[PDB]
Amino acid sequence: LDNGLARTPTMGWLHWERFMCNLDCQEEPDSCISEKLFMEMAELMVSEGWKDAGYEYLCIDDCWMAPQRDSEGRLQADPQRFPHGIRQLANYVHSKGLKLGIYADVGNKTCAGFPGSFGYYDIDAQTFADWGVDLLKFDGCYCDSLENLADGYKHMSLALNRTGRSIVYSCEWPLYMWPFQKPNYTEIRQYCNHWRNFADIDDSWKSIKSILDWTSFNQERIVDVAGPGGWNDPDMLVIGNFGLSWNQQVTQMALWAIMAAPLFMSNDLRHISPQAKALLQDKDVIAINQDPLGKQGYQLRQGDNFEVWERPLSGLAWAVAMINRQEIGGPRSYTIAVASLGKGVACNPACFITQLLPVKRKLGFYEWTSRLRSHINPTGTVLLQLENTM
Amino acid sequence: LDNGLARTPTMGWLHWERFMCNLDCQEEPDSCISEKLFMEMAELMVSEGWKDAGYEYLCIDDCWMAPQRDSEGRLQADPQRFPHGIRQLANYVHSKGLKLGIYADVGNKTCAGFPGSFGYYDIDAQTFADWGVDLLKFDGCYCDSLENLADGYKHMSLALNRTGRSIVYSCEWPLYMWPFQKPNYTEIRQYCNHWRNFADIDDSWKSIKSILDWTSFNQERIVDVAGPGGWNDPDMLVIGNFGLSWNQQVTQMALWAIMAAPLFMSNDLRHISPQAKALLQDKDVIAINQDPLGKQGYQLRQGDNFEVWERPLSGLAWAVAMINRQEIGGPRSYTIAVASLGKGVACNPACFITQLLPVKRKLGFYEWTSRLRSHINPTGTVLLQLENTMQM
Numbered sequence A: 001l002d003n004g005l006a007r008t009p010t011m012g013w014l015h016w017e018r019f020m021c022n023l024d025c026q027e028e029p030d031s032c033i034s035e036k037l038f039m040e041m042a043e044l045m046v047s048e049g050w051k052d053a054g055y056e057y058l059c060i061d062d063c064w065m066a067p068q069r070d071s072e073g074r075l076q077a078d079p080q081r082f083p084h085g086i087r088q089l090a091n092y093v094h095s096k097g098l099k100l101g102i103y104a105d106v107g108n109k110t111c112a113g114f115p116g117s118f119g120y121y122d123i124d125a126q127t128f129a130d131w132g133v134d135l136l137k138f139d140g141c142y143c144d145s146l147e148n149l150a151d152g153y154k155h156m157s158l159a160l161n162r163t164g165r166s167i168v169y170s171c172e173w174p175l176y177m178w179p180f181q182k183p184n185y186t187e188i189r190q191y192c193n194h195w196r197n198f199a200d201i202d203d204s205w206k207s208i209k210s211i212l213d214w215t216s217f218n219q220e221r222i223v224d225v226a227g228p229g230g231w232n233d234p235d236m237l238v239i240g241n242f243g244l245s246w247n248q249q250v251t252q253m254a255l256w257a258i259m260a261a262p263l264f265m266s267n268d269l270r271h272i273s274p275q276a277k278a279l280l281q282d283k284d285v286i287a288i289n290q291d292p293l294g295k296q297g298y299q300l301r302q303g304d305n306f307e308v309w310e311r312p313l314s315g316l317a318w319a320v321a322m323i324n325r326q327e328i329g330g331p332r333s334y335t336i337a338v339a340s341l342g343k344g345v346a347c348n349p350a351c352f353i354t355q356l357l358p359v360k361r362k363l364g365f366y367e368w369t370s371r372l373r374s375h376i377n378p379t380g381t382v383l384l385q386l387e388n389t390m
Numbered sequence B: 001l002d003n004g005l006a007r008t009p010t011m012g013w014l015h016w017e018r019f020m021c022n023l024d025c026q027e028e029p030d031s032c033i034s035e036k037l038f039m040e041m042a043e044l045m046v047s048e049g050w051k052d053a054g055y056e057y058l059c060i061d062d063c064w065m066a067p068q069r070d071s072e073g074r075l076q077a078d079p080q081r082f083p084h085g086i087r088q089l090a091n092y093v094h095s096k097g098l099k100l101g102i103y104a105d106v107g108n109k110t111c112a113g114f115p116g117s118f119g120y121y122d123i124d125a126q127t128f129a130d131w132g133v134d135l136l137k138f139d140g141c142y143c144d145s146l147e148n149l150a151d152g153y154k155h156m157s158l159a160l161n162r163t164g165r166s167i168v169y170s171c172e173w174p175l176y177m178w179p180f181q182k183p184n185y186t187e188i189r190q191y192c193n194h195w196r197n198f199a200d201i202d203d204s205w206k207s208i209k210s211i212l213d214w215t216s217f218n219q220e221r222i223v224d225v226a227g228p229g230g231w232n233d234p235d236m237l238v239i240g241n242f243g244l245s246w247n248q249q250v251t252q253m254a255l256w257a258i259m260a261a262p263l264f265m266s267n268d269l270r271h272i273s274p275q276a277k278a279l280l281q282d283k284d285v286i287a288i289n290q291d292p293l294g295k296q297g298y299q300l301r302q303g304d305n306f307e308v309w310e311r312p313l314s315g316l317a318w319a320v321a322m323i324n325r326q327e328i329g330g331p332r333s334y335t336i337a338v339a340s341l342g343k344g345v346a347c348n349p350a351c352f353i354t355q356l357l358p359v360k361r362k363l364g365f366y367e368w369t370s371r372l373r374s375h376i377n378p379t380g381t382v383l384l385q386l387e388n389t390m391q392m
């Protein structure tokens, strides 16, 4: 989408994975989907260094709406859970130097059963712009035809443009097309700043593996369309929650950097460990994810329960990730000729290699003839940056 | 097995899950199966508080043997990896106040392909006894006949008895029966101090879920057989390795306590986080696992991606574990009538409830009519101890 936005992958916080559709504000006031929850996350994004690291978009997912539209046919936030309304929340978020994302659905209802946007695309876009919304996640539930799906996503894209406000447009179009016909990613990229490809993430290593394996399987089709203005979205970061070991969290951070994925945390910023916070705020890894060149990495090799991924970066540098997919035993040794990396150019005549994950360590100079040897933890990843000696 | 051993579940360290059959001592010296690895592990078991916590048996798994037996037809240790031999390793282990377990197979070869014990049961039992072996793990590979499996396990049991040395006998008999017929656990308990029931564990939450779900599903068959001298073995503890989140590690520790499982760590004691060490050395949870009553717990309840397990303890106390199996979202609320726990006995007329996992905190007095309210993390477990009391 050529709207001047998402020139690097969007970074921020989205409530869905950790908070879901919790409407019980009476019994769970601190975890229900409410204006107070978002104010708390905004305050912590400022005070705990998240904004400084690049996490800029504070996004509402499903279950913010009132059960029905108002007398004017416009969407409204829930009167009890969002008493001051979305425009007022957007004012607060902006006063912290942050941006607000909101959620809507192309069909007749949202996935949770709240008002859909079919029939109201222009009214809904103008409402969002009037509210000061900075990003829209547009879901695909309750949509009876592929044609309505396509028409709705394109129509909403254009209506957002017509409002005159800069609004990141996050689509789920491919995900809902895929079971029925193969998406045309050139078209989707014309209309979307990033697009969900695969099933929802959850708090599990199984989910991470299946997202990586799907991206791996379809990379011929999706890698080259990604670039400034339009990204593949493998769904939220779940670092900081409950289901991933430290090494599985490292694998997610490293591979979301390799994949030039949007970095949407879905966690509880009020209760997050120092390790998880340091990983999500890792400056070198975010710099890889945010590389201005914007070329999505890809899987180079797969075999012996090992995976090698690499990503070309700005100025003749490369990122390389090595995954140990064996879920038994100990740190397993992997060696690869450095001449096989970076299309044979990364380390010709030589390169300086810095390991970034799981710990930062300079490895030294590698000649074009060298072999790189590493020990990779089960379900973990070693992330390296290669700088050509020039 | 009525040999006076394993009156509580055996506690120790077993190399298989973390170290497997790594024979490459040139390229992988720190992880190959060698006498130095076990000597170092023994020293760390002493110095790092593992022995004090109850972990007593330092156990070798597969891939310690030489490719064939010696001229006297006796098993021999690998010359390169175990140059000083099993007796000196046992002397070292004993000199640290620990006990040494070793491995063998009922069939013609071990699962890794080293000499089997069929034909040498008495010779091998005497070899182990002469070496100072204190525990035997007896695998079931390369024995495709049920009669040979059964007779071999019974035979090795009697041969160990004949040596006159106290040797914990750890069997895999039930696991290897399953392809053909359902085990007779009364007979297995007759011959074994503990017995592997289900497929090998690995470093994953999937593996733990599958062990728990199989145990739950089959609990009618196996729970009542367990008791002093003979235990169900759901396989090794993998806390301290790479595949489990903190909450999944808590779930394994808690539920191995509920199940009266042998506690065999399989990790690298040289590289283990303070958290994992504190969990594996948790004195209250180990005390539950080692409860002298020795009655295995069971799944009480299941539903809405929740599980409730409980275990009866000595002196009218109970352990209660609540598992959240929903792998999305945040901590989920669970409430239960305190009268539904512990067969209605735990909190009659009252009980004092102490949370032990994920953190230790006293919850207070709950009368028989009370409700217990808890919040459980995704894939995590809340472990509670209920002490029967007449006090308020």
Ligand SMILES: *[C@@H]1O[C@H](CO)[C@@H](O[C@@H]2O[C@H](CO)[C@@H](O[C@@H]3O[C@H](CO)[C@@H](O)[C@H](O[C@H]4O[C@H](CO)[C@@H](O)[C@H](O)[C@@H]4O)[C@@H]3O)[C@H](O)[C@H]2NC(C)=O)[C@H](O)[C@H]1NC(C)=O
Pocket: A002, A003, A004, A160, A161, A162, A163, A164, A165, A166, A167
């Ligand atoms: C509605 O849709 C229209 C058409 O798709 C869209 O207009 C496009 O806007 C983008 C960005 O605002 C334009 O891209 C810019 O083109 C100008 C040409 O003068 C360049 O100078 C810009 O360069 C930027 O980036 C440079 C490095 O690449 C930097 O030097 C600097 O940061 C510049 O800002 C940039 O390439 C694009 O040309 C137009 N296209 C058309 C047909 O007008 C509009 O933004 C959409 N409106 C909304 C509200 O979404």
Ligand SMILES: *[C@@H]1O[C@H](CO)[C@@H](O[C@@H]2O[C@H](CO)[C@@H](O[C@@H]3O[C@H](CO)[C@@H](O)[C@H](O[C@H]4O[C@H](CO)[C@@H](O)[C@H](O)[C@@H]4O)[C@@H]3O)[C@H](O)[C@H]2NC(C)=O)[C@H](O)[C@H]1NC(C)=O
Pocket: B002, B003, B004, B005, B007, B160, B161, B163, B164, B165, B166, B167
């Ligand atoms: C070879 O096999 C035989 C049996 O096949 C085995 O001897 C048996 O097991 C134990 C040996 O320790 C004996 O059990 C003891 O019996 C006396 C009877 O008065 C009891 O006082 C003992 O009780 C104490 O220890 C128990 C722990 O086991 C506690 O439950 C109790 O509270 C006491 O502390 C104990 O029950 C059993 O009688 C024999 N049975 C026979 C001989 O028929 C022998 O040990 C095996 N040898 C080797 C080397 O394994």
Ligand SMILES: *[C@@H]1O[C@H](CO)[C@@H](O[C@@H]2O[C@H](CO)[C@@H](O)[C@H](O)[C@H]2NC(C)=O)[C@H](O)[C@H]1NC(C)=O
Pocket: A184, A185, A186, A187, A190
């Ligand atoms: C996928 O969609 C794109 C855009 O909708 C198609 O590309 C356009 O094709 C028309 C001719 O049909 C050209 O006039 C345009 O210049 C093309 N646009 C771009 C950006 O290349 C493309 O043909 C579609 N692919 C398939 C296989 O249907």
Ligand SMILES: *[C@@H]1O[C@H](CO)[C@@H](O)[C@H](O)[C@H]1NC(C)=O
Pocket: A106, A107, A108, A118, A142, A143, A144, A145, A148, A149
């Ligand atoms: C919404 O419902 C109406 C009537 O039931 C139907 O005509 C329309 O196609 C639906 N829209 C979508 C996107 O499914």
Ligand SMILES: *[C@@H]1O[C@H](CO)[C@@H](O)[C@H](O)[C@H]1NC(C)=O
Pocket: B184, B185, B186, B187, B190
């Ligand atoms: C199981 O084995 C024991 C010991 O031989 C025997 O007493 C019992 O009858 C057996 N059970 C069945 C069902 O055969």
Ligand SMILES: OC[C@H]1N[C@H](CO)[C@@H](O)[C@H]1O
Pocket: A016, A061, A062, A110, A111, A112, A139, A172, A199, A200
């Ligand atoms: O109802 C909201 C949910 N619907 C999407 C389906 O992919 C999820 O990401 C989340 O937004």
Ligand SMILES: OC[C@H]1N[C@H](CO)[C@@H](O)[C@H]1O
Pocket: B016, B061, B062, B110, B111, B112, B139, B172, B200
């Ligand atoms: O070869 C060694 C393996 N044999 C058993 C099969 O279940 C495993 O526990 C491990 O001991």
